[PDB]
Chain A
Amino acid sequence: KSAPATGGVKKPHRYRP
Protein backbone atom coordinates (compact mmCIF):
# COMPACT_ATOMS: atom_id res chain seq x y z
CA LYS A 1 0.00 0.00 0.00
CA SER A 2 0.92 3.69 0.29
CA ALA A 3 -2.42 5.22 1.35
CA PRO A 4 -5.49 4.34 3.49
CA ALA A 5 -8.21 2.07 2.09
CA THR A 6 -10.73 4.51 3.58
CA GLY A 7 -10.38 8.29 3.80
CA GLY A 8 -9.91 11.56 1.94
CA VAL A 9 -11.82 14.79 1.31
CA LYS A 10 -14.59 15.64 -1.17
CA LYS A 11 -13.19 19.13 -1.73
CA PRO A 12 -11.34 18.70 -5.09
CA HIS A 13 -7.98 20.17 -6.20
CA ARG A 14 -7.04 23.60 -4.82
CA TYR A 15 -4.38 25.57 -6.72
CA ARG A 16 -3.01 28.78 -5.23
CA PRO A 17 -1.82 31.92 -7.07
Chain B
Amino acid sequence: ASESETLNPSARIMTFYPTMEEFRNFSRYIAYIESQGAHRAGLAKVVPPKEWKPRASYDDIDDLVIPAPIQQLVTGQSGLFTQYNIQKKAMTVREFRKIANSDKYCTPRYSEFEELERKYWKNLTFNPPIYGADVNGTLYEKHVDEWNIGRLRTILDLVEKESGITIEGVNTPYLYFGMWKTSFAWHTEDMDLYSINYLHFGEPKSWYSVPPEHGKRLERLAKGFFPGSAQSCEAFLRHKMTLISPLMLKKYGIPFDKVTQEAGEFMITFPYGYHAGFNHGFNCAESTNFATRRWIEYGKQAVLCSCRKDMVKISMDVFVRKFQPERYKLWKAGKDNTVIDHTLPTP
Protein backbone atom coordinates (compact mmCIF):
# COMPACT_ATOMS: atom_id res chain seq x y z
CA ALA B 1 0.00 0.00 0.00
CA SER B 2 1.63 3.22 -1.21
CA GLU B 3 -1.05 5.86 -0.50
CA SER B 4 -2.56 4.65 -3.79
CA GLU B 5 -4.13 1.58 -2.22
CA THR B 6 -4.41 3.66 0.96
CA LEU B 7 -7.03 5.92 -0.67
CA ASN B 8 -10.62 4.63 -0.61
CA PRO B 9 -9.40 1.18 0.59
CA SER B 10 -12.97 -0.14 0.72
CA ALA B 11 -13.33 0.96 -2.90
CA ARG B 12 -16.83 2.34 -2.30
CA ILE B 13 -18.89 4.74 -4.40
CA MET B 14 -17.90 8.27 -3.39
CA THR B 15 -19.94 11.42 -4.01
CA PHE B 16 -18.40 14.83 -4.75
CA TYR B 17 -19.76 18.36 -4.52
CA PRO B 18 -17.40 20.57 -6.54
CA THR B 19 -17.55 24.34 -6.35
CA MET B 20 -18.25 26.22 -9.56
CA GLU B 21 -14.49 26.84 -9.66
CA GLU B 22 -13.53 23.17 -9.46
CA PHE B 23 -16.43 22.23 -11.73
CA ARG B 24 -15.13 24.56 -14.48
CA ASN B 25 -12.29 22.25 -15.64
CA PHE B 26 -13.69 18.80 -16.44
CA SER B 27 -10.51 16.80 -17.02
CA ARG B 28 -8.93 18.46 -13.98
CA TYR B 29 -11.76 17.52 -11.66
CA ILE B 30 -11.67 13.91 -12.89
CA ALA B 31 -7.99 13.71 -12.05
CA TYR B 32 -8.92 15.26 -8.72
CA ILE B 33 -11.53 12.66 -7.75
CA GLU B 34 -9.13 9.93 -8.79
CA SER B 35 -6.57 11.45 -6.42
CA GLN B 36 -9.18 10.76 -3.72
CA GLY B 37 -9.48 7.16 -4.96
CA ALA B 38 -12.95 7.50 -6.55
CA HIS B 39 -11.96 5.22 -9.45
CA ARG B 40 -11.49 2.29 -7.02
CA ALA B 41 -15.26 1.74 -6.89
CA GLY B 42 -15.60 2.02 -10.66
CA LEU B 43 -18.44 4.51 -10.20
CA ALA B 44 -18.63 7.97 -8.60
CA LYS B 45 -21.40 10.55 -8.27
CA VAL B 46 -20.83 14.23 -8.81
CA VAL B 47 -23.39 16.80 -7.71
CA PRO B 48 -22.99 20.04 -9.69
CA PRO B 49 -23.13 23.40 -7.90
CA LYS B 50 -26.81 24.30 -7.36
CA GLU B 51 -26.56 27.40 -9.58
CA TRP B 52 -25.49 25.35 -12.61
CA LYS B 53 -27.92 24.19 -15.29
CA PRO B 54 -27.45 22.80 -18.84
CA ARG B 55 -30.90 23.86 -20.05
CA ALA B 56 -33.57 26.38 -19.07
CA SER B 57 -36.52 23.97 -19.21
CA TYR B 58 -37.57 20.72 -20.85
CA ASP B 59 -41.12 21.79 -21.70
CA ASP B 60 -40.39 21.63 -25.41
CA ILE B 61 -39.43 18.02 -26.06
CA ASP B 62 -42.81 16.28 -26.21
CA ASP B 63 -42.12 16.55 -29.95
CA LEU B 64 -38.66 14.95 -29.82
CA VAL B 65 -38.63 11.70 -31.77
CA ILE B 66 -37.36 8.41 -30.39
CA PRO B 67 -36.39 6.69 -33.67
CA ALA B 68 -35.92 3.19 -32.29
CA PRO B 69 -37.48 2.53 -28.88
CA ILE B 70 -37.01 -1.03 -27.59
CA GLN B 71 -39.20 -3.29 -25.48
CA GLN B 72 -37.15 -5.18 -22.89
CA LEU B 73 -38.19 -8.81 -22.65
CA VAL B 74 -36.30 -10.54 -19.84
CA THR B 75 -36.05 -14.29 -19.28
CA GLY B 76 -34.48 -15.97 -16.26
CA GLN B 77 -34.80 -16.97 -12.61
CA SER B 78 -32.92 -17.07 -9.30
CA GLY B 79 -31.11 -13.79 -9.91
CA LEU B 80 -29.78 -14.66 -13.40
CA PHE B 81 -31.44 -13.21 -16.49
CA THR B 82 -30.95 -12.46 -20.16
CA GLN B 83 -32.54 -9.38 -21.72
CA TYR B 84 -33.75 -9.35 -25.32
CA ASN B 85 -34.36 -5.87 -26.72
CA ILE B 86 -37.13 -5.79 -29.34
CA GLN B 87 -37.20 -2.72 -31.59
CA LYS B 88 -40.51 -0.86 -31.63
CA LYS B 89 -41.74 1.76 -34.09
CA ALA B 90 -40.55 5.34 -33.66
CA MET B 91 -42.50 7.50 -31.24
CA THR B 92 -42.38 10.96 -29.67
CA VAL B 93 -41.51 11.70 -26.07
CA ARG B 94 -45.19 12.58 -25.58
CA GLU B 95 -46.30 9.09 -26.61
CA PHE B 96 -43.50 7.55 -24.51
CA ARG B 97 -44.31 9.65 -21.45
CA LYS B 98 -47.97 8.68 -21.92
CA ILE B 99 -47.22 4.96 -21.72
CA ALA B 100 -44.57 5.44 -19.02
CA ASN B 101 -47.06 7.19 -16.73
CA SER B 102 -49.94 4.82 -17.59
CA ASP B 103 -51.02 2.62 -14.68
CA LYS B 104 -49.92 -0.30 -16.85
CA TYR B 105 -46.22 0.64 -16.76
CA CYS B 106 -46.39 3.13 -13.89
CA THR B 107 -43.95 2.97 -10.97
CA PRO B 108 -45.31 0.85 -8.11
CA ARG B 109 -45.76 2.38 -4.65
CA TYR B 110 -43.09 1.79 -2.02
CA SER B 111 -41.64 3.16 1.21
CA GLU B 112 -37.86 2.80 1.00
CA PHE B 113 -35.65 2.17 -2.05
CA GLU B 114 -34.86 -1.24 -0.58
CA GLU B 115 -38.50 -2.15 -1.27
CA LEU B 116 -38.47 -0.65 -4.76
CA GLU B 117 -35.29 -2.65 -5.37
CA ARG B 118 -36.92 -5.90 -4.25
CA LYS B 119 -39.90 -5.19 -6.51
CA TYR B 120 -37.55 -4.62 -9.43
CA TRP B 121 -35.75 -7.97 -9.01
CA LYS B 122 -39.07 -9.68 -8.37
CA ASN B 123 -40.94 -8.46 -11.47
CA LEU B 124 -38.27 -7.61 -14.07
CA THR B 125 -39.44 -10.52 -16.26
CA PHE B 126 -43.09 -9.37 -16.20
CA ASN B 127 -44.90 -6.63 -18.14
CA PRO B 128 -41.94 -5.84 -20.49
CA PRO B 129 -41.37 -2.05 -20.44
CA ILE B 130 -40.20 0.14 -23.31
CA TYR B 131 -36.92 2.04 -23.21
CA GLY B 132 -36.17 4.95 -25.51
CA ALA B 133 -32.45 4.32 -25.29
CA ASP B 134 -29.40 5.26 -27.35
CA VAL B 135 -31.00 8.30 -29.01
CA ASN B 136 -28.57 10.58 -30.89
CA GLY B 137 -28.71 14.11 -29.50
CA THR B 138 -28.09 16.53 -26.64
CA LEU B 139 -30.25 18.64 -24.35
CA TYR B 140 -27.43 20.98 -23.39
CA GLU B 141 -27.66 24.58 -24.51
CA LYS B 142 -24.93 25.81 -26.88
CA HIS B 143 -23.54 28.24 -24.27
CA VAL B 144 -22.99 25.68 -21.48
CA ASP B 145 -19.22 25.18 -21.40
CA GLU B 146 -19.01 23.36 -18.08
CA TRP B 147 -19.33 19.56 -18.24
CA ASN B 148 -20.98 19.73 -21.66
CA ILE B 149 -21.40 16.07 -22.59
CA GLY B 150 -21.40 17.31 -26.17
CA ARG B 151 -17.81 18.55 -25.93
CA LEU B 152 -15.86 17.44 -22.86
CA ARG B 153 -12.56 18.08 -24.68
CA THR B 154 -10.71 14.98 -23.43
CA ILE B 155 -7.98 13.12 -25.34
CA LEU B 156 -10.73 10.87 -26.69
CA ASP B 157 -11.22 13.68 -29.23
CA LEU B 158 -7.99 12.43 -30.82
CA VAL B 159 -9.99 9.68 -32.56
CA GLU B 160 -12.16 12.12 -34.49
CA LYS B 161 -9.25 14.57 -34.76
CA GLU B 162 -6.84 12.05 -36.31
CA SER B 163 -9.28 10.10 -38.51
CA GLY B 164 -12.53 12.07 -38.71
CA ILE B 165 -14.29 8.88 -37.57
CA THR B 166 -17.43 9.33 -35.49
CA ILE B 167 -18.74 6.58 -33.19
CA GLU B 168 -22.30 7.50 -32.11
CA GLY B 169 -22.70 7.36 -28.35
CA VAL B 170 -18.94 7.07 -27.75
CA ASN B 171 -17.53 10.37 -29.01
CA THR B 172 -21.03 11.73 -29.59
CA PRO B 173 -23.92 12.17 -27.09
CA TYR B 174 -26.83 9.77 -26.49
CA LEU B 175 -30.13 10.42 -24.71
CA TYR B 176 -32.02 7.76 -22.76
CA PHE B 177 -35.73 8.03 -21.94
CA GLY B 178 -36.66 5.49 -19.32
CA MET B 179 -39.69 4.22 -17.42
CA TRP B 180 -40.12 1.99 -14.38
CA LYS B 181 -38.17 -1.27 -14.64
CA THR B 182 -36.20 -0.33 -17.76
CA SER B 183 -32.65 -1.47 -17.17
CA PHE B 184 -29.07 -1.61 -18.38
CA ALA B 185 -27.24 -4.93 -18.09
CA TRP B 186 -23.79 -5.52 -16.59
CA HIS B 187 -21.00 -4.10 -18.74
CA THR B 188 -17.90 -1.95 -18.91
CA GLU B 189 -17.73 0.80 -21.54
CA ASP B 190 -16.64 0.07 -25.10
CA MET B 191 -12.79 -0.09 -25.18
CA ASP B 192 -13.12 0.10 -21.38
CA LEU B 193 -13.44 3.87 -21.64
CA TYR B 194 -14.93 6.17 -18.99
CA SER B 195 -18.56 7.23 -19.28
CA ILE B 196 -20.40 10.28 -18.03
CA ASN B 197 -24.13 10.24 -17.30
CA TYR B 198 -26.33 13.22 -16.49
CA LEU B 199 -29.92 12.76 -15.38
CA HIS B 200 -31.71 15.75 -16.92
CA PHE B 201 -35.09 15.13 -15.27
CA GLY B 202 -37.55 12.55 -13.95
CA GLU B 203 -37.45 9.66 -11.50
CA PRO B 204 -34.09 8.29 -10.22
CA LYS B 205 -31.73 5.77 -11.79
CA SER B 206 -30.15 3.21 -9.46
CA TRP B 207 -26.71 1.76 -10.18
CA TYR B 208 -24.70 -1.27 -9.09
CA SER B 209 -20.93 -1.29 -9.53
CA VAL B 210 -18.04 -3.71 -9.19
CA PRO B 211 -14.56 -2.34 -8.42
CA PRO B 212 -12.27 -2.60 -11.46
CA GLU B 213 -9.91 -4.41 -9.09
CA HIS B 214 -12.46 -7.26 -9.04
CA GLY B 215 -13.80 -7.10 -12.59
CA LYS B 216 -12.21 -10.38 -13.67
CA ARG B 217 -14.02 -12.11 -10.83
CA LEU B 218 -17.38 -10.87 -12.10
CA GLU B 219 -16.48 -12.17 -15.57
CA ARG B 220 -15.52 -15.62 -14.22
CA LEU B 221 -18.85 -15.81 -12.40
CA ALA B 222 -20.71 -14.70 -15.54
CA LYS B 223 -18.84 -17.21 -17.71
CA GLY B 224 -19.87 -19.95 -15.31
CA PHE B 225 -23.53 -19.01 -15.32
CA PHE B 226 -23.71 -18.59 -19.10
CA PRO B 227 -21.18 -21.13 -20.44
CA GLY B 228 -22.78 -21.20 -23.87
CA SER B 229 -22.58 -17.45 -24.37
CA ALA B 230 -19.05 -17.43 -23.00
CA GLN B 231 -17.76 -19.95 -25.54
CA SER B 232 -19.37 -18.16 -28.49
CA CYS B 233 -17.82 -14.82 -27.44
CA GLU B 234 -15.33 -14.33 -24.59
CA ALA B 235 -16.56 -10.74 -24.14
CA PHE B 236 -20.24 -11.71 -24.28
CA LEU B 237 -21.04 -9.22 -21.49
CA ARG B 238 -20.48 -6.51 -24.11
CA HIS B 239 -23.70 -7.71 -25.77
CA LYS B 240 -25.35 -5.93 -22.81
CA MET B 241 -27.94 -8.68 -22.30
CA THR B 242 -26.82 -10.14 -18.94
CA LEU B 243 -28.58 -9.24 -15.70
CA ILE B 244 -27.36 -10.50 -12.31
CA SER B 245 -29.02 -9.54 -9.03
CA PRO B 246 -27.03 -8.23 -6.07
CA LEU B 247 -28.08 -11.27 -4.01
CA MET B 248 -26.27 -13.48 -6.53
CA LEU B 249 -23.15 -11.31 -6.41
CA LYS B 250 -23.37 -11.44 -2.61
CA LYS B 251 -23.78 -15.22 -2.66
CA TYR B 252 -20.59 -15.66 -4.68
CA GLY B 253 -18.44 -13.16 -2.83
CA ILE B 254 -18.26 -10.57 -5.61
CA PRO B 255 -17.78 -7.13 -4.02
CA PHE B 256 -20.04 -4.36 -5.27
CA ASP B 257 -21.74 -1.17 -4.14
CA LYS B 258 -25.01 0.50 -5.10
CA VAL B 259 -26.04 4.10 -5.53
CA THR B 260 -29.12 5.98 -6.70
CA GLN B 261 -28.77 8.91 -9.11
CA GLU B 262 -31.22 11.82 -8.75
CA ALA B 263 -32.27 14.33 -11.41
CA GLY B 264 -29.54 16.95 -11.80
CA GLU B 265 -26.78 14.56 -10.74
CA PHE B 266 -23.84 13.21 -12.77
CA MET B 267 -22.51 9.66 -12.63
CA ILE B 268 -19.01 8.75 -13.79
CA THR B 269 -17.92 5.21 -14.57
CA PHE B 270 -14.22 4.40 -14.71
CA PRO B 271 -12.18 2.16 -17.02
CA TYR B 272 -13.03 -1.50 -16.58
CA GLY B 273 -15.67 -0.69 -13.98
CA TYR B 274 -18.59 -3.07 -14.49
CA HIS B 275 -21.99 -1.53 -13.81
CA ALA B 276 -25.72 -2.24 -14.20
CA GLY B 277 -28.97 -0.67 -13.04
CA PHE B 278 -32.60 0.27 -13.65
CA ASN B 279 -34.80 3.38 -13.84
CA HIS B 280 -37.36 4.21 -11.11
CA GLY B 281 -39.78 5.72 -13.58
CA PHE B 282 -40.10 8.24 -16.37
CA ASN B 283 -36.79 10.07 -16.74
CA CYS B 284 -34.26 11.34 -19.28
CA ALA B 285 -30.50 10.91 -19.18
CA GLU B 286 -27.65 11.94 -21.47
CA SER B 287 -24.25 10.28 -21.70
CA THR B 288 -21.16 9.64 -23.78
CA ASN B 289 -17.71 8.18 -23.26
CA PHE B 290 -14.51 10.05 -22.54
CA ALA B 291 -10.85 9.23 -22.08
CA THR B 292 -7.97 10.13 -19.79
CA ARG B 293 -4.24 9.36 -20.07
CA ARG B 294 -4.81 6.63 -17.48
CA TRP B 295 -7.37 5.00 -19.82
CA ILE B 296 -4.73 4.36 -22.52
CA GLU B 297 -3.37 1.17 -20.93
CA TYR B 298 -6.94 -0.04 -20.42
CA GLY B 299 -7.73 0.62 -24.07
CA LYS B 300 -4.71 -1.37 -25.20
CA GLN B 301 -5.73 -4.39 -23.14
CA ALA B 302 -9.53 -4.23 -23.58
CA VAL B 303 -11.01 -7.63 -24.49
CA LEU B 304 -13.43 -7.01 -27.34
CA CYS B 305 -16.40 -8.90 -28.77
CA SER B 306 -15.74 -10.19 -32.28
CA CYS B 307 -18.74 -12.48 -32.70
CA ARG B 308 -20.59 -9.34 -33.81
CA LYS B 309 -19.67 -6.99 -36.63
CA ASP B 310 -20.74 -3.46 -35.72
CA MET B 311 -19.16 -3.37 -32.26
CA VAL B 312 -17.12 -0.36 -31.23
CA LYS B 313 -13.43 -0.76 -32.03
CA ILE B 314 -10.84 2.02 -31.59
CA SER B 315 -7.29 1.94 -32.95
CA MET B 316 -4.97 2.57 -29.99
CA ASP B 317 -2.12 3.37 -32.37
CA VAL B 318 -2.62 7.14 -32.24
CA PHE B 319 -2.66 7.13 -28.43
CA VAL B 320 0.37 4.91 -27.87
CA ARG B 321 2.36 6.90 -30.39
CA LYS B 322 1.49 10.25 -28.87
CA PHE B 323 1.51 9.38 -25.15
CA GLN B 324 3.74 6.29 -24.94
CA PRO B 325 6.41 6.97 -27.58
CA GLU B 326 9.03 5.00 -25.65
CA ARG B 327 6.83 1.91 -25.87
CA TYR B 328 5.33 2.28 -29.34
CA LYS B 329 7.91 0.06 -31.05
CA LEU B 330 7.62 -2.62 -28.33
CA TRP B 331 3.81 -2.50 -28.31
CA LYS B 332 3.63 -2.62 -32.10
CA ALA B 333 5.69 -5.80 -31.80
CA GLY B 334 3.26 -7.29 -29.29
CA LYS B 335 5.96 -7.31 -26.60
CA ASP B 336 4.36 -4.71 -24.32
CA ASN B 337 3.50 -6.77 -21.23
CA THR B 338 2.55 -3.88 -18.95
CA VAL B 339 0.37 -4.85 -15.97
CA ILE B 340 -2.43 -2.49 -14.99
CA ASP B 341 -2.66 -1.23 -11.41
CA HIS B 342 -6.33 -0.34 -10.91
CA THR B 343 -5.61 1.75 -7.80
CA LEU B 344 -2.82 3.84 -9.32
CA PRO B 345 -3.98 7.32 -10.50
CA THR B 346 -1.85 9.31 -12.95
CA PRO B 347 1.38 10.57 -11.34
Minimum distance in angstroms from B85 CB to a CB of chain A: 6
Per the 8 Å Cβ criterion, residues 2-17 of A in contact with B are 2-17
Interface residues on A, range: 10 to 19
* Smallest CB gap from B287: residue in A: A10
Whether B86 and A11, one on each chain, are in contact in the complex, defined by CB atoms closer than 8 angstroms, is no
Q: In the complex, A14 Cα to B132 Cα: how many Å? A: 12
Which chain B positions have C-beta within 8 A of A4?
313
* Smallest CB gap from A2: residue in B: B309
Minimum distance in angstroms from B128 CB to a CB of chain A: 12
Count A-B contacts at CB 8 Å: 69
Which chain A positions have C-beta within 8 A of B167?
6-10
Whether B313 and A7, one on each chain, are in contact in the complex, defined by CB atoms closer than 8 angstroms, is yes
Q: In the complex, A8 Cα to B168 Cα: how many Å? A: 8
Interface: B134 (CB within 8 A): yes
Q: In the complex, A9 Cα to B85 Cα: how many Å? A: 16
Whether B87 and A8, one on each chain, are in contact in the complex, defined by CB atoms closer than 8 angstroms, is no
* Smallest CB gap from A6: residue in B: B315
Which chain A positions have C-beta within 8 A of B317?
5
Interface: B70 (CB within 8 A): yes
Interface: B165 (CB within 8 A): yes
* Smallest CB gap from A4: residue in B: B313
Which chain B positions have C-beta within 8 A of A17?
86-87
Q: In the complex, A10 Cα to B239 Cα: how many Å? A: 10
How many chain-B residues does the 8 Å CB contact rule pick out? 30
Whether A6 and B159, one on each chain, are in contact in the complex, defined by CB atoms closer than 8 angstroms, is yes
Q: Of A2, A6, A9, A15, which is within 8 A of B87 by CB?
A: A15
Q: In the complex, A7 Cα to B68 Cα: how many Å? A: 21
Q: In the complex, A9 Cα to B170 Cα: how many Å? A: 8
Binary CB contact string for chain B from 314 to 328 against chain A (1 if under 8 A, 0 otherwise): 110100000000000
* Smallest CB gap from B185: residue in A: A12
* Smallest CB gap from A3: residue in B: B309
Whether A10 and B170, one on each chain, are in contact in the complex, defined by CB atoms closer than 8 angstroms, is yes
Which chain A positions have C-beta within 8 A of B86?
15-17
Whether B165 and A6, one on each chain, are in contact in the complex, defined by CB atoms closer than 8 angstroms, is yes
Whether A10 and B312, one on each chain, are in contact in the complex, defined by CB atoms closer than 8 angstroms, is yes
Most buried by A among B70, B133, B241: B70
Whether B315 and A9, one on each chain, are in contact in the complex, defined by CB atoms closer than 8 angstroms, is no
Q: In the complex, A4 Cα to B165 Cα: how many Å? A: 11
Whether A7 and B241, one on each chain, are in contact in the complex, defined by CB atoms closer than 8 angstroms, is no
Q: In the complex, A14 Cα to B289 Cα: how many Å? A: 21
The 8 A-B residue pairs with the shortest CB-CB distance in the complex, in nearest-first order: A10-B169, A11-B134, A8-B312, A5-B315, A12-B240, A6-B315, A14-B87, A16-B87
A selection of 12 A-B contacts at a CB cut-off of 8 Å is: A6-B315, A7-B165, A9-B169, A10-B174, A11-B133, A12-B239, A14-B70, A14-B85, A15-B85, A15-B86, A16-B87, A17-B87
